[PDB]
Ligand binder design. Structure first.
Ligand SMILES: [Mg+2]
Ligand SMILES: [Mg+2]
Ligand SMILES: [Mg+2]
Ligand SMILES: [Mg+2]
Ligand SMILES: [Mg+2]
Ligand SMILES: [Mg+2]
Ligand SMILES: [Mg+2]
Ligand SMILES: [Mg+2]
Ligand SMILES: [Mg+2]
Ligand SMILES: [Mg+2]
Ligand SMILES: [Mg+2]
Ligand SMILES: [Mg+2]
Ligand SMILES: [Mg+2]
Ligand SMILES: [Mg+2]
Ligand SMILES: [Mg+2]
Ligand SMILES: [Mg+2]
Ligand SMILES: [Mg+2]
Ligand SMILES: [Mg+2]
Ligand SMILES: [Mg+2]
Ligand SMILES: [Mg+2]
Ligand SMILES: [Mg+2]
Ligand SMILES: [Mg+2]
Ligand SMILES: [Mg+2]
Ligand SMILES: [Mg+2]
Ligand SMILES: [Mg+2]
Ligand SMILES: [Mg+2]
Ligand SMILES: [Mg+2]
Ligand SMILES: [Mg+2]
Ligand SMILES: [Mg+2]
Ligand SMILES: [Mg+2]
Ligand SMILES: [Mg+2]
Ligand SMILES: [Mg+2]
Ligand SMILES: [Mg+2]
Ligand SMILES: [Mg+2]
Ligand SMILES: [Mg+2]
Ligand SMILES: [Mg+2]
Ligand SMILES: [Mg+2]
Ligand SMILES: [Mg+2]
Ligand SMILES: [Mg+2]
Ligand SMILES: [Mg+2]
Ligand SMILES: [Mg+2]
Ligand SMILES: [Mg+2]
Ligand SMILES: [Mg+2]
Lengths: 57, 117, 127, 110
RNA sequence: GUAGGGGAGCGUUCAGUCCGCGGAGAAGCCAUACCGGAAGGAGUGGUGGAGCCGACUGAAGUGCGGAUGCCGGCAUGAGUAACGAUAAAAGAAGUGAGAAUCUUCUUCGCCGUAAGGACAAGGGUUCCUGGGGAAGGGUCGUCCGCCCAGGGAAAGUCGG
RNA sequence: AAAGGUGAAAAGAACCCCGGGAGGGGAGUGAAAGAGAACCUGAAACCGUGGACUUACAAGCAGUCAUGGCACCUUAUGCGUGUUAUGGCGUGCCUAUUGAAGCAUGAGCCGGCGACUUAGACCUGACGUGCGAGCUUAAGUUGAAAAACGGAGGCGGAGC
RNA sequence: GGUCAAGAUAGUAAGGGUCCACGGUGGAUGCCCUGGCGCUGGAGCCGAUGAAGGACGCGAUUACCUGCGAAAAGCCCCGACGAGCUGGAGAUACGCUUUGACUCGGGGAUGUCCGAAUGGGGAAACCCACCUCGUAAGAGGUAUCCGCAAGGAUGGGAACUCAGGGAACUGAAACAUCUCAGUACCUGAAGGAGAAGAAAGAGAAUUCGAUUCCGUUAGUAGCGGCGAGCGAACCCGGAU
């Protein structure tokens, strides 16, 4: 029992591994009213608009 | 009095390390593995001075054989041909004639097959 | 200029569109994950993306972004509608260290790392 | 390792004496000894003078406020002057009265 | 050419003497394609901010990659295991720079010879009030057994 | 146990900008904030940003040699510097061993600490120096920004 | 040129690599001193008149340190200095000082509680008494051993000294006599030193003349499972 790594992993390796941790930036749209930005199919967090006006102020 | 290391070890170290640029990974950044890599490098340097002298001869010979055979002659027969007619050329030079100057190499060929007759 | 000292009197170094959060109690690789989205991007964008990125780090980084904005506008009289994140990076603060118990007698050391976030705003014309 | 240690906690001049500034930026300017601290070897002369800042504190007054006040100097840039010469001058201890010790130059006395 | 013997030297501190540099900038640090047969040594430039090179001579705590060596810093494993009983949570409301975690309301769930209450031993201000939020809290905290300040403990009859 | 260093002097940064703060950018002081209180220098490991040339048909102790490509020009237009493509060649270091790339030992990494010395008035050789059929003092005494005295003793002088 | 065909080659890098630039981390290096180390020389005892070492206190604000002790960062007189002072502490306020402060030198007064502790007890620094004076406040006394008394003792002190007691590892290439070694350690008593000392001696010249210490004799004479190894003294020269 008790596996353990045989050898330090190179800085190079370690970083090759990390080639996939890129965050994915939001696709962001600009609210058709109050004008800041929002997520598709969410309520625009600036005004509160989702066609008329749902969340409060 | 006491005498610390002060300054010497780091100078040695940087010496090795600075010999070692362009070495892959730790081989160029860690002292010990640098110094080590370098021992093996020693072997390779000395050896290959002799050995490159071995290698270039080879190359010349290849080219010579080629030219020889363009005009219907083997190399070996071409070289006894040259020694017979007491033409005394470097094979470095023979190669360069063979590669660079067609007609001239041709002339040496005819001279040599004459020396063979 | 004739003397180093002469220059040190005459010039004084400036940090044009630059802010730095020092000793942010976070981990660099984390904070970077956020930052790499911000970088190269035109300040407005950055301001938004930071509001919709759902990492913690997103917030300190928002704050430095604004500090660099208020340094390029105020202390440097630059042009908002032309600002972009010319450069941004994270380096390691002095990392907090604490003992934590483990099974049987063994003990361990957690590294609560810290962070230096740095943003550098700068105007962009194409020509 | 106090500053007075080297100078035996001794002042080579009294408070209220006039003094010429020997060394530094204020060479030769002159003034009355407003404050003299023996152990620290520091002395105030109405000529040095800096601009200090009072920062936050709502006393004195909520806002900050800057200020002009002189900043003490090291004993060794101070000397008794001689009314005749008018310049930087050494001192001899001689006698008067009636048990008083006094201070002369190469032409007494201050 | 291994153990080993022999020979000529390189570099380090301190010491004596000689030379002599240094705020128009020393030692140290950094880069470098030059020099020497090697230890090594100079040239220039960047750093630095007050001491120091060369020569001869003397004395050593005098030269490191190893010792599962010692002290220290930082890597790998890795954004991995884990976040400490499977008694369980939901909404509203409030607060606040910021709330899944704090406060209130309404419910829900779990202990009930206990997971309730009261002493002793031990601990030592942890109690109450008001404030705070770096760290401590395995998240978060505006909260706390944490941090700051001020209050609080009353015996002829209980215990000594 | 670990612990040290602003600056000549606190003149310890009024005031303005982002932030709850932390932190920072200005301004002002300072010779210098390329000294701002996580304050002398600030190496290496180790973490990042940017740029050069590069890498997605490839078998590798990572070097070394040769050549071609690109790039660059402050001991630099050649004997080049960096970087690379391709070919040839190549079994880490240390220790321990008859024999080590060994699937035998040690070792994460770098930085520092880290191992043939001292003593006696001992023994025995080599080198050197002073006296030389002779040579020398020890305790001590006096002097002492030095040294001189001091013959007690010891060594040669004959062996068996 | 267009279509088709056959062939050859290029660029893009998710990430990596080498080098360069610029930073972060970190605390090597250099410089420095407020701290040490050794040698030489000086100086050497404290304590029932309460010590060494403490506890609790004393401050305009006081946690730490220093100084002090309910007369509490200090009180009295003397001497020095002669303008600053109000401790490290650097902080605000109160103020003191040329009628001589602060600091330095020298004596006294006060000196809570514990600690040889000593009124009795006790888990040190706390609990409970008795006697004489006193108006109460308060003050003083109340241990044991030597002595008639006076007075002395107890406790503490790094090393150094003497004394009572007295190891083993180890060396003997094993071990037992032997050696380590009368060393380590333990106890005792005492001082600034102590020990030792005024020949029933050393010795071989019918010589020397209290003891200790240094040189020397001398690794000599001897000792010894005659193995390992142990090892004088006299003379002579000094210190006193
Ligand atoms: Mg050959
Ligand atoms: Mg040889
Ligand atoms: Mg020298
Ligand atoms: Mg030096
Ligand atoms: Mg090592
Ligand atoms: Mg291990
Ligand atoms: Mg370690
Ligand atoms: Mg994951
Ligand atoms: Mg895994
Ligand atoms: Mg998993
Ligand atoms: Mg899990
Ligand atoms: Mg839990
Ligand atoms: Mg659950
Ligand atoms: Mg509100
Ligand atoms: Mg919960
Ligand atoms: Mg309600
Ligand atoms: Mg209960
Ligand atoms: Mg209690
Ligand atoms: Mg937390
Ligand atoms: Mg609040
Ligand atoms: Mg509470
Ligand atoms: Mg009652
Ligand atoms: Mg601030
Ligand atoms: Mg200026
Ligand atoms: Mg790059
Ligand atoms: Mg293929
Ligand atoms: Mg390819
Ligand atoms: Mg074997
Ligand atoms: Mg062998
Ligand atoms: Mg292997
Ligand atoms: Mg191996
Ligand atoms: Mg073995
Ligand atoms: Mg291993
Ligand atoms: Mg000789
Ligand atoms: Mg990419
Ligand atoms: Mg106290
Ligand atoms: Mg009293
Ligand atoms: Mg007086
Ligand atoms: Mg005085
Ligand atoms: Mg008692
Ligand atoms: Mg035994
Ligand atoms: Mg034995
Ligand atoms: Mg005694």
């Amino acid at each position: 029992k008790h596996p353990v790594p045989k050898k330090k992993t190179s800085k190079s390796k370690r970083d090759m591994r990390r080639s996939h941790h890129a965050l994915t930036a939001p696709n962001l749209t600009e609210c058709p009213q109050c004008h800041g930005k929002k997520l598709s199919h969410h309520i625009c967090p600036n005004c509160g608009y989702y066609d008329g006006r749902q969340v409060l102020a | 009095p006491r005498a610390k290391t002060g300054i010497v070890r780091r100078r040695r170290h940087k010496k090795v390390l600075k010999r070692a640029k362009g070495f892959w990974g730790s081989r160029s950044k860690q002292y010990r593995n640098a110094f080590q890599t370098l021992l093996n490098a020693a072997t390779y340097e000395y050896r290959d001075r002799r050995n490159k002298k071995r290698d270039f001869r080879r190359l010349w010979i290849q080219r010579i054989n080629a030219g020889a055979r363009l005009h219907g002659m083997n190399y070996s027969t071409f070289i006894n041909g040259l020694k017979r007619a007491n033409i005394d050329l470097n094979r470095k030079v023979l190669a360069d004639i063979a590669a660079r100057e067609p007609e001239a190499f041709k002339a040496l060929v005819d001279a040599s097959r004459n020396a063979r007759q | 200029f004739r003397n180093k000292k002469q220059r040190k009197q005459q010039v004084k170094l400036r940090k044009p569109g630059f802010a730095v959060a020092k000793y942010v109690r976070m981990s660099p690789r984390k904070v970077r994950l956020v930052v790499d989205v911000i970088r190269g991007k035109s300040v407005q964008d950055a301001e938004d993306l930071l509001r919709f990125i759902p990492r913690s780090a997103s917030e300190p980084v928002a704050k430095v972004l604004n500090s660099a904005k208020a340094n390029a506008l105020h202390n440097d009289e630059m042009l908002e509608d032309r600002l972009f994140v010319k450069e941004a990076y994270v380096d390691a603060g002095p990392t907090l260290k604490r003992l934590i118990p483990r099974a049987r007698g063994s003990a361990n050391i957690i590294k609560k790392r810290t962070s230096h976030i740095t943003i550098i705003v700068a105007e962009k014309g194409n020509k | 390792p106090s500053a007075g240690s080297h100078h035996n906690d001794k002042l080579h001049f009294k408070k209220g004496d006039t003094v010429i500034v020997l060394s530094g930026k204020h060479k030769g300017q002159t003034g009355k000894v407003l404050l003299a601290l023996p152990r620290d070897q520091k002395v105030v002369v109405e000529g040095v003078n800096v601009i200090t800042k009072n920062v936050k504190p709502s006393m004195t007054n909520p806002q900050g406020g800057q200020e002009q006040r002189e900043l003490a100097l090291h004993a060794s840039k101070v000397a008794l002057v001689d009314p005749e010469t008018g310049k930087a001058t050494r001192v001899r201890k001689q006698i008067v009265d009636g048990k008083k010790v006094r201070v002369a130059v190469a032409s007494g006395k201050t």
